[PDB]
Amino acid sequence: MDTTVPTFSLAELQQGLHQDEFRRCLRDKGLFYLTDCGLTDTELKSAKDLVIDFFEHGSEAEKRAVTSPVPTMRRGFTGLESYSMCYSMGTADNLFPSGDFERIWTQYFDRQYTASRAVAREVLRATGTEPDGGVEAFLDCEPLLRFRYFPQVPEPLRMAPHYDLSMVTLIQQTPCANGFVSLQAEVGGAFTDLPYRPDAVLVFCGAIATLVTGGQVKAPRHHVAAPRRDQIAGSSRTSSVFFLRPNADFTFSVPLARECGFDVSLDGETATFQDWI
Ligand SMILES: CC1(C)S[C@@H]2[C@H](NC(=O)[C@@H](N)c3ccccc3)C(=O)N2[C@H]1C(=O)O
Ligand SMILES: [Fe+3]
Numbered sequence: 001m002d003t004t005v006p007t008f009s010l011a012e013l014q015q016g017l018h019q020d021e022f023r024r025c026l027r028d029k030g031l032f033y034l035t036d037c038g039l040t041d042t043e044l045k046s047a048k049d050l051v052i053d054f055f056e057h058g059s060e061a062e063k064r065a066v067t068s069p070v071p072t073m074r075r076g077f078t079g080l081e082s083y084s085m086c087y088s089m090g091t092a093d094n095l096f097p098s099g100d101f102e103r104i105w106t107q108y109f110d111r112q113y114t115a116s117r118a119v120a121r122e123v124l125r126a127t128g129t130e131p132d133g134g135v136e137a138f139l140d141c142e143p144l145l146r147f148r149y150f151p152q153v154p155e156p157l158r159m160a161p162h163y164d165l166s167m168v169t170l171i172q173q174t175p176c177a178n179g180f181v182s183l184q185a186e187v188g189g190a191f192t193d194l195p196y197r198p199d200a201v202l203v204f205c206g207a208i209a210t211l212v213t214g215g216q217v218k219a220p221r222h223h224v225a226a227p228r229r230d231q232i233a234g235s236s237r238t239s240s241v242f243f244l245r246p247n248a249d250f251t252f253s254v255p256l257a258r259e260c261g262f263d264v265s266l267d268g269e270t271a272t273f274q275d276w277i
Contacts, residue, residue, distance in 0.1 A: 002188040005029070007200060009036040010115075013122050023126055029187055030205040030218035033197055037115040041199055044172050047108040048238055051087055052149060054097050055080055066095040074144065084150040090143065109145055116143070116170050116244040119203060123168065127216040138212075138250070141167075144243045152236045156228060161186065161221035163262070165277070166206035166243040173202075177234030185222035194222075208245075208273075210260055211252045219260075248274035 006025055008018060025032055060081075068076040068088070076095035079085045089095075089109060096102045117139045124135055131138040173183065173196045181193035185204075194202055209217040227235050250273045258264045265276055 002028070003190045003192045005031060005033060005187060005192060005194065007033040007035060007197075010034055010118060010122065011036040013126075019126070022122075026123060026126060026205065026209075026217045028218060030209070030220045031185060031187070031194075031222075032203050033200040034119065034203050035200050037118055037201065038111060039115055039172065039201055043108055043111060044174070044240060047104055047147070047240075048149070048174065050101060050104055051147065054101070055085055055149065055151075058097065062097060066097055068095075074146075084148060086149070087147045089145050112145060112170060112240075112242045113143055113244075115201070116168055116242055119170070120168050120244055123205065123209060123217065124213070127213045129213045129216070131212055138246065139167075139244075141244060141246050142248070143245055145240070146243075147238065147240045149238045150236060152232075152234075154232060156226050158225070159223060161223045163219040163221050164204055164206035164243065165208070166204075166245050167208040167212065168244050169204045169206055170242040170244075171202040171204070171239055173239040174237055176237050178231060180227055180231050180235055182225050182227065182237065183222070183239075184225055185220045187220070206243075207262055208250075210262075211257060215256065215260065246273050248272060 006021065006029075008022060012018060013022060022032075058080075063077070063081055066076045067081070068074070068078050073093075074088045075090065075093055077085065077087050089105065096105070120139055121135060124131070171183070171194075175196040176182070181195045183194045183202075184191045185194060186192075204220060204222065205217050206219050210219045251270055253270050254264075254266070254268060
């Protein structure tokens, strides 16, 4: 029945407002838009503008020097040379075309990481959860930021819904000129579209939220629908996805894990994050 996605301000949540609405949302939907956390459309536009700049005007040699050496190294670019381009970075071992690039993207990462820690803090507090070793050690982690740009042109294997392997994930997207929403999830047994919203950021909870809160938070299945050969006049878009992932050494009791419906990939009593990849 219920297929709407609520918006909340983070400031408002930190002041004890909307406690019930937010508790229920987490348990029943695991996803929500969020205002008044320290991100801006502008910050995003400028990080984007700088990447696209490089994509178009970068020497062939410059590009080689920061293309990702191997798929394992999820750092640097992919798909920019001679179904789209992609830039990835983490807390370290990053690759960088220029000095001003380093500064803008390092700052955009820190900001995204500060926001995503803040949201996570709120998700734990709402469900009364103190992970072992404390909230802060848990939240001080090994995150990853994938930015992805789909350019234009004019001259489709539908992948299946997944849940994310993250405490939380934050998505900012620029829109499509043609109104096409490429991002969909399951809210109350239906597929709901999740557009760009002005000065909001989309937030999925993930497996680790479910695990860490003892089952209290849902991790919604979602997928990125590509467009067909008919709605591509004005369908350039970007998204910026930030995975707040735990430290490899984090652990969870396996009775509880399969109890939800996640890939039982290890045959043990309890386990850690890293081997589950
Ligand atoms: C479409 C998405 C927003 S979600 C999807 C997927 N997320 C995961 O499975 C994630 N837990 C993961 C990432 C990398 C290695 C192992 C596991 C991913 O990556 N895609 C994103 C994207 O556009 O880059
Ligand atoms: Fe995902």
